[PDB]
């Protein structure tokens, strides 16, 4: 009873002391020598104008041209970024959609939200329409994120405090990741997809192992919910977006915080986080109605993407690093460059 | 300058735009009602009168409603309550037989205070239903109301006890100039509840129309 709690407190004490020992010099001291990125001025190359409600998620295709966006007008819309054309428009059974994924192969998209179901859509059908491939049921809370591993496996993040790994052909949870004590809000697959990170409402981020399904590491420091998470392109770090108006960079190997991306006159929480192809810019959509670009190695804010008339809810960077799409609670997605 | 295939792609996108716009027109004329309540507080009773989210569809006198029951969403409400910013009205159910069954009246009262004063529902009217009137009427005589609110200076009789509870709920509203509260005492189950919803919703519709026209 009390002995177990005392032993848990002892283990936490020992862990924090061990990860304090490894912290000899901060990231700022190491990167105090490189020239600043300067000023990053990005103009809106495209405005995508189809949605009729708040856009809650977008995902880029791996070809860096097609993207899918979800809004609560009940539509999944697949855009052609270059020409602004709408490739597909997918009517959702439940319009309470909070998340959106685009399969790495491009054959599928996934969708989920307040109906506790992740729905998989077959984009490339012999019948010329988009159909519901599989409805993945089994979560007892809303779906807050989903990310395809391949055409057959998808990891889902839920508000019932658990992440799950699914097997789309059968629909059964291959593995359930149960460590969190609050709603799990985001999700980021490692580049090699051997492992992933999740940010939850208990102000903690947990590093998982997809193969054997246990929480490898737990990263703390945020003062409120974590609404968005994203891996550094290296696969050895990630950045979290929290409601306490702060982004943080956590290192898997050093095993704690590296740098804090906050400013005094930013008081609103971050809704989205994404890195640039080099990992030198960190982009975070805020509740200021606008995105903010951060020099990830110096914490200096390098630019602002101010083109939205409501909260920036979703945000992504192409795999070639070429453009940034930001969706917002006004019904527009804007492509920057 | 466009290819034949690319012009056909643009034409397809225009048809997609047209259908999206049609769907938006068809959906903008649904009345979106968000049904709340502390626990089992007569919510099922009025759903009879009229997964994680349950949508109910019905039509009353040529008006189409949608009722979103989120009683099964047993997760942190602050992370999905903004999804409903923009509903026509909120139907809040309180089972006022539970003024002494634990405390639950106080829990319903904090839920009402949280929802009414929320920053997403600042112009969203609230249709406060006060259910289980009969059980409260033939229970207030035995168990006094003083168990719930000590400061109640009134006789243990139904017709003023219910008014006191209504007053305590309506005094939680800190937006008395942007949103209305339409209280209704409901245990008759005689199609009065949907009529009350229809009246409150038509008032909200007229006000929303005036907002849109700029007139307000």
């Amino acid at each position: 009873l009390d002995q177990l709690r005392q032993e848990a407190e002892q283990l936490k004490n020992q862990i924090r002391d061990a990860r304090k020992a490894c912290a000899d010099a901060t990231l700022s001291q190491i990167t105090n020598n490189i020239d600043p990125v300067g000023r990053i001025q990005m103009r809106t190359r495209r405005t995508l104008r189809g949605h009729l409600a708040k856009i809650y998620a977008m995902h880029w295709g791996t070809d860096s041209r097609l993207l899918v966006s979800a809004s609560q007008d009940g539509k999944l819309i697949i855009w052609d970024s270059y020409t602004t054309n709408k490739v597909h428009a997918i009517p959702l059974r439940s319009s309470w959609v909070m998340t959106c994924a685009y399969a790495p192969s491009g054959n599928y998209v996934a969708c989920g939200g307040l109906d506790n179901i992740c729905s998989i859509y077959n984009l490339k059908t012999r019948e010329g329409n988009v159909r519901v491939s599989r409805e993945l049921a089994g979560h007892t809370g809303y779906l807050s994120c989903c990310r395809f591993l391949d055409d057959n496996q998808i990891v889902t993040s839920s508000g019932d405090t658990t992440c799950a790994l699914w097997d789309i052909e059968t629909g059964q949870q291959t593995t359930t990741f149960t460590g969190h004590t609050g709603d799990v809000m985001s999700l980021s697959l490692a580049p090699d997809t051997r492992l992933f990170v999740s940010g939850a409402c208990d102000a903690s981020a947990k590093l998982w192992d997809v193969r054997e399904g246990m929480c490898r590491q737990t990263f703390t420091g945020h003062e409120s919910d974590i609404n968005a998470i994203c891996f550094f392109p290296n696969g050895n770090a990630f950045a979290t977006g929290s409601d306490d108006a702060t982004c943080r960079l956590f290192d898997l190997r050093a095993d704690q915080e590296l740098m804090t991306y906050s400013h005094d006159n930013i008081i609103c929480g971050i809704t989205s986080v994404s890195f640039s192809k080099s990992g030198r810019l960190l982009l975070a959509g805020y509740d200021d109605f606008n995105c903010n670009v951060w020099d990830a190695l110096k914490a200096d804010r390098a630019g602002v993407l101010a083109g939205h008339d409501n909260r920036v809810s979703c945000l992504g960077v192409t795999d070639d690093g070429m453009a940034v799409a930001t969706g917002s609670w006004d019904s527009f997605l804007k492509i920057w460059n | 300058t466009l290819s034949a295939e690319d012009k056909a792609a643009v034409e397809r996108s225009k048809m997609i735009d047209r259908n999206l716009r049609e769907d938006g027109e068809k959906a903008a004329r649904e009345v979106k009602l968000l049904l709340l309540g502390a626990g089992e507080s007569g919510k099922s009773t009025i759903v009879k009168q009229m997964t994680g989210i349950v949508e109910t569809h019905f039509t009353f006198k040529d008006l189409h409603f949608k009722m979103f029951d989120v009683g099964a969403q047993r997760s942190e409400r602050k992370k999905w309550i903004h999804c409903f910013e923009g509903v026509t009205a909120i139907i809040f159910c309180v089972a006022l037989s539970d003024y002494d069954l634990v405390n639950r009246m106080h829990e319903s009262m904090k839920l009402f205070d949280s929802i009414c004063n929320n920053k997403w529902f600042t112009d969203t009217s609230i249709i406060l239903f006060l259910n289980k009137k009969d059980l409260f009427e033939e229970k207030i005589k035995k168990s006094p109301l003083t168990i719930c609110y000590p400061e109640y200076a009134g006789s243990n009789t139904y017709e003023e006890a219910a008014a006191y509870i209504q007053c305590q709920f309506e005094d939680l509203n800190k937006r008395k100039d942007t949103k209305e509260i339409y209280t209704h005492f409901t245990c008759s189950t005689d199609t009065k509840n949907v009529q009350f919803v229809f009246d409150a919703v038509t008032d909200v519709i007229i006000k929303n129309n005036l907002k849109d026209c700029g007139l307000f």
Partner: single-chain antibody, 233 residues
Framework: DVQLVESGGGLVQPGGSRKLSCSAS????????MHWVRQAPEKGLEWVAY????????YYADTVKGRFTISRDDPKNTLFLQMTSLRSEDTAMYYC??????????????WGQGTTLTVSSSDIVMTQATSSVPVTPGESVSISCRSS???????????LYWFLQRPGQSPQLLIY???NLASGVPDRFSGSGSGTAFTLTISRLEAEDVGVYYC?????????FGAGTKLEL
């Protein structure tokens, strides 16, 4: 079950009128642009008309424009060709071909089985110099097509298509935009070429690859076919 079945063909007196139908089945007919493609009894293919999805765009071959009318009944999933004043140059087998255009789609992918009409008695030119070539099974053969204009558009696409018409069979899409393999086409097919010069390569040719190979251009309307390279043995 994606079948398109044509009907309405038959022997018609010259100068008369006849209406062709194409009853779709097993696909979202309303989303597909639909073509009519013609083949004379001993000649290669020849595009005839095209009606868009939503009927908003219609095109005709200049040799039929004014005489022919293409139309569709989306509720009934039927595609129509109304032919008036049928000349002797209109004896042929008419094919109903579906084609859907969006980024990365595969136009001309499914072809009907065709109906036969017998009438009783500028434009890009696509060249297939080799009218026939003898091939042994297991061997590798390459078919060449040449264009009078650069098929490569400013957007990077090279609107060249390859179709195979096995004997006594309807044409089958092999390669769209000069490089992309159609679904269900074995990987031993491959298409390559610069502007105006194109090649289709069959590696380890085996039976049921014999037939006539057509090269079509989808860069501009009218769509024009090659004469056809025929493979035997």
């Amino acid at each position: 079950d994606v079948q398109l079945v044509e009907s309405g063909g038959g022997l018609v007196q010259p100068g008369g009128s006849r209406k062709l139908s194409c009853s779709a089945s097993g696909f979202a007919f309303s989303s597909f642009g639909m073509h009519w493609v013609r083949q004379a009894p001993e000649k290669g293919l020849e595009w005839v008309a095209y009606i868009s999805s939503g009927s908003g765009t219609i095109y005709y071959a200049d040799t039929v424009k004014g005489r022919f009318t293409i139309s569709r009944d989306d509720p009934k999933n039927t595609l129509f060709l109304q032919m008036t004043s049928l000349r002797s140059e209109d004896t042929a087998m008419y094919y109903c071909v579906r084609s859907i255009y969006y980024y990365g789609s595969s136009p001309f992918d499914f072809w009907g089985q065709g109906t036969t009409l017998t009438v009783s008695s500028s434009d890009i030119v696509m060249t297939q110099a080799t009218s026939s070539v003898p091939v042994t099974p297991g061997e590798s053969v390459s078919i060449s097509c040449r264009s009078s204009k650069s098929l490569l558009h400013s957007n990077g696409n090279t609107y060249l298509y390859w179709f195979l018409q096995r004997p006594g069979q309807s044409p089958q899409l092999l390669i769209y935009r000069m490089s992309n393999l159609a679904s269900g086409v074995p990987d031993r097919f491959s298409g390559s070429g610069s502007g105006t010069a194109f090649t289709l390569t069959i590696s380890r040719l085996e039976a049921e690859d014999v037939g006539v190979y057509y090269c079509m251009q989808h860069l501009e309307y009218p769509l024009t076919f090659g004469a056809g390279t025929k493979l035997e043995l």
